[PDB]
Design a protein around this nucleic acid. Sequence first.
RNA 1: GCGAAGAACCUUACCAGGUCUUGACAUCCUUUGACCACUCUGGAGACAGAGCUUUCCCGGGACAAAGUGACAGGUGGU
RNA 2: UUAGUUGGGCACUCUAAAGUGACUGCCGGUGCAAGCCGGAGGAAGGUGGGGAUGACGUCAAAUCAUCAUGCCCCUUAUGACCUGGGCUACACACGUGCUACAAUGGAUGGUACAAAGGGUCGCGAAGCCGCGAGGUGGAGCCAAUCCCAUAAAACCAUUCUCAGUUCGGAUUGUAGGCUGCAACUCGCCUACAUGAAGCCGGAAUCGCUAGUAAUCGUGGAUCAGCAUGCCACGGUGAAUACGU
Lengths: 81, 126, 114, 151, 97, 100, 60
Amino acid sequence: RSLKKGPFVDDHLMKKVEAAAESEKKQVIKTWSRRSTIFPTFVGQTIAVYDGRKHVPVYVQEDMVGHKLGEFAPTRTYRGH
Amino acid sequence: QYYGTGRRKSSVARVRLVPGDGKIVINNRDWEDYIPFAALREVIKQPLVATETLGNYDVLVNVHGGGYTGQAGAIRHGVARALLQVAPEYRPALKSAGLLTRDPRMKERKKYGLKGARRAPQFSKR
Amino acid sequence: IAGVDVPREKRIVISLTYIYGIGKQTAKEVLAEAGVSEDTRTRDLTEEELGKIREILDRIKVEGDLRREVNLNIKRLIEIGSYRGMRHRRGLPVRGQNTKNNARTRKGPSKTVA
Amino acid sequence: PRKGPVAKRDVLPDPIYNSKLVTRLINKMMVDGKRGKSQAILYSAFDIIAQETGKDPMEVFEQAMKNIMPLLEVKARRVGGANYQVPIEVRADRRSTLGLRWLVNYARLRGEKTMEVRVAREIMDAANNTGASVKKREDTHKMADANRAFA
Amino acid sequence: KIRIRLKAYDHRILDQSAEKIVETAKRSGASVSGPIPLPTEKSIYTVLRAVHKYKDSREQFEMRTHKRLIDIVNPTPQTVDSLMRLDLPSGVDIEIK
Amino acid sequence: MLKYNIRGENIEVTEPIRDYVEKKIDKLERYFTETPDANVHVNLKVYSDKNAKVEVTIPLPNLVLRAEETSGDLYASIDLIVDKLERQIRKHKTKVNRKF
Amino acid sequence: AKKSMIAKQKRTPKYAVQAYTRCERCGRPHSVIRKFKLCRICFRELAYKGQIPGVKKASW
RNA sequence: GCGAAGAACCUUACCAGGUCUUGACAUCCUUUGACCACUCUGGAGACAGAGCUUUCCCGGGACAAAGUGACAGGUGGU
RNA sequence: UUAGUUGGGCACUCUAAAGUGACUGCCGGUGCAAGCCGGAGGAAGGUGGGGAUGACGUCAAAUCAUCAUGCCCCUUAUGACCUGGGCUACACACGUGCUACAAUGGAUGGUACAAAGGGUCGCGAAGCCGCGAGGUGGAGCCAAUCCCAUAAAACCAUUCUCAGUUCGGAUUGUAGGCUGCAACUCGCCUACAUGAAGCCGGAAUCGCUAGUAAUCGUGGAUCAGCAUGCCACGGUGAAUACGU
Ligand SMILES: [Mg+2]
Ligand SMILES: [Mg+2]
Ligand SMILES: [Mg+2]
Ligand SMILES: [Mg+2]
Ligand SMILES: [Mg+2]
Ligand SMILES: [Mg+2]
Ligand SMILES: [Mg+2]
Ligand SMILES: [Mg+2]
Ligand SMILES: [Mg+2]
Ligand SMILES: [Mg+2]
Ligand SMILES: [Mg+2]
Ligand SMILES: [Mg+2]
Ligand SMILES: [Mg+2]
Ligand SMILES: [Mg+2]
Ligand SMILES: [Mg+2]
Ligand SMILES: [Mg+2]
Ligand SMILES: [Mg+2]
Ligand SMILES: [Mg+2]
Ligand SMILES: [Mg+2]
Ligand SMILES: [Mg+2]
Ligand SMILES: [Mg+2]
Ligand SMILES: [Mg+2]
Ligand SMILES: [Mg+2]
Ligand SMILES: [Mg+2]
Ligand SMILES: [Mg+2]
Ligand SMILES: [Mg+2]
Ligand SMILES: [Mg+2]
Ligand SMILES: [Mg+2]
Ligand SMILES: [Mg+2]
Ligand SMILES: [Mg+2]
Ligand SMILES: [Mg+2]
Ligand SMILES: [Mg+2]
Ligand SMILES: [Mg+2]
Ligand SMILES: [Mg+2]
Ligand SMILES: [Mg+2]
Ligand SMILES: [Mg+2]
Ligand SMILES: [Mg+2]
Ligand SMILES: [Mg+2]
Ligand SMILES: [Mg+2]
Ligand SMILES: [Mg+2]
Ligand SMILES: [Mg+2]
Ligand SMILES: [Zn+2]
């Protein structure tokens, strides 16, 4: 939602990140929701994101907030011609 | 107060001739305002020029359709036909000058497979 | 003269747009707000007029630090490790357009044939 | 083309100046069907010509055209050799065609300011055998007279 | 005080019933205004001719609709029920006011 | 320089096939002082009875070379197609020289 | 996978934006007119037989 | 600028992971006969676990299920 | 009357049914006939202009993927479902197009003239808000009634002064709008800023015979949203054809 109605995050991922609020922090969150935007609540956690064939890990840092998860999980493999 | 009807392209003009001075009025507007450009004015006068009847009638016209040039031709045809309407004697001069024939030229249909009415797409031989 | 040199024979509305951060519309705003007419040659400007112009211009972003601000934006989005950052590294169209043909004002002139 | 000669399209004489060649000149400076632009840039030219010179504009136009229309012209064809540039007499109609074509193909390139002037001082130059179009006619005449045997 | 609109895909079938209405109306003493031919509406459908290839070859079909209009200004109940119980051939559309 | 567009229907284009086509068609450059830049086009098909068909098209500056040939083997079809192409070359050259 | 596709298309999808249209005689998904709910082939072959009212060949 | 008169998901026929087996789709036999819906929990979703009904309609029909079988099913090939 | 608005009239345009009208018909010459050239009358003269119409057959031309079918093949999978990706990759090469390279122009303000189409799970006006894309609102409309929709070139004024620029717009940074459960790979649009190549394009090559070429806009099918593509409509509107 790129309007002023509000941000967008899938509830089946928001539930996981806010239930991972404990100090344990040893629950790497696996997800397929590439389209979910990154909230400030995500800070600290570590999320594996599906990029088509595997779950690649991303570490949600401070300046990564606001973007979409799928940005950090490339889906094409390019090396050179 | 004698009628006449002129058509050209997609434009229709209803002309009517009254005896009088010669002031020219188009669609409740003056002939110098509605058609401003100087040389787009001699087209209407030619039917009144091929015979020396320049200041013998005032025209009242109601025109619609087409662009500024096309309705000039329509109103030309209309005023000529009205001139024949007033006097059944002026036919030889105008028919001689070819000022009665309606223009049978109309914009042409488009055609499928062609970029216009006759333009064909580019083709290569190298 | 006003942060950087400007042409002399051109009108000030056309001369102020030689600064990295001023264009056709914000120059009009500066000239209208200050009071000078947009049809006065800059060589005909009084000292008080240019004096008034200078701080109005310096309040809003200036040609100097805008370079570093936009460059640090690019550096932030390229150090994060995003798709746009990878494009900025490799030098390819950042906005989502095709690259089989017509990516030339980025990739440069048509390189040597393979 | 292949069946037989085809009738031309008569040009209705222009208003104001009441001539034939003036309308055919207006039709040549036309671009993209813009009649008004050509009309204005020709009437401005024939007015400033009177302002500068003091003569009737049409007289200057005629006495400048009479120097540009060529007579002989080289045609590459058979008869007298396989494309040996046989010089031939241009027909009566072809004269004004070439004259206007050369008058306009060079008034586009004089290059000082708006063409509304570039066409005027080319008519003045043609009025006394100078410029570029007159040079074109002289060059064509020289080349035609070079092949005085292939006729 | 009633207005009748008749529309159909064929003018030949249409106008027979269009007139049938005006005679069946004015025979029972009705002041009726004759049919007024409204503009027809024609639409074009261009479809590729081949099955797989050849976009340059097509075929075009059309569907055109004709319309009429009838007015009665001073009716009587006999005209009303005569028009209402009169039945038209299928192929026309009648919209009695 | 010659640019080859090679298409293979009901077959896969294999590197030795490409090299053979390249060299055989490149032997066509000897008929000109200046080597052209035209796009050579080649099509290869194989039927069910082991018969192979090869089609070749070359748009020269003022000449169009077309040649199709079917035979029991693909390589033989290539060789015969080269012979056909050089035949068109000689025909055109003799005609244009005669029309001097 | 053809006969399953028609069955899926007639079902109700998860969200409205996933709905789409196919021809009704044949199951062709591309180039289907919503006036007739027919493709461009079941329209040509079947307007010739005079089975679509009103529609005839155009010559204007 | 051809099938495509319009690929974010669907389209989609391709790939990765998770799943099903008379089946997503039809005739056909046994019986319950309305299954269906809908609410919540778990999961990325397909799907599982519960709760509410099932007034089927008028022995026939519409549909369903349960196992049940002959069978379907292929945008696979020329 | 805010004005075709209101009462009033179908006179004129207009819509669309039935007819007339063009047939070498007449005249002059020619030929012997078919016919040819010239003229008359006419809105139109020599199949008036344009469509639809595509013979026997050639290329084993194209489509088993629109549909149908012979034979073969897979049948706990070559059948079926779900989420995420891909068809949008990028050292390069070829084809079709759009926009420019400026003064017949750029920018600002004033103002006039169309044809053909679409609209009830639809078109959506006035009014207010916002620089702008747009938001709020709900008038009229199953439409010759209401809406999309006060066409743009053109015309009249002012300014710029031949520069890689007050030409050109790519590329990029920031902030927003709409549709959609969802806009990162992968949508369209807007505002500020940035400001690239490009100064009429080698060999070669394409289109067009009159309302045509050129140029400027408008509508529709597909469609929640997305066209410089496709199919239609009009406005201004030329040059040349000696000849095979
Ligand atoms: Mg055609
Ligand atoms: Mg053609
Ligand atoms: Mg600059
Ligand atoms: Mg700007
Ligand atoms: Mg794109
Ligand atoms: Mg390209
Ligand atoms: Mg095409
Ligand atoms: Mg068609
Ligand atoms: Mg094939
Ligand atoms: Mg050999
Ligand atoms: Mg099937
Ligand atoms: Mg679905
Ligand atoms: Mg859709
Ligand atoms: Mg579809
Ligand atoms: Mg899928
Ligand atoms: Mg349950
Ligand atoms: Mg239950
Ligand atoms: Mg079977
Ligand atoms: Mg009215
Ligand atoms: Mg005779
Ligand atoms: Mg005659
Ligand atoms: Mg004809
Ligand atoms: Mg026939
Ligand atoms: Mg072939
Ligand atoms: Mg099959
Ligand atoms: Mg298994
Ligand atoms: Mg594609
Ligand atoms: Mg600009
Ligand atoms: Mg303006
Ligand atoms: Mg209309
Ligand atoms: Mg609409
Ligand atoms: Mg629409
Ligand atoms: Mg309402
Ligand atoms: Mg619109
Ligand atoms: Mg100047
Ligand atoms: Mg984006
Ligand atoms: Mg340069
Ligand atoms: Mg320059
Ligand atoms: Mg022709
Ligand atoms: Mg002709
Ligand atoms: Mg749309
Ligand atoms: Zn179909």
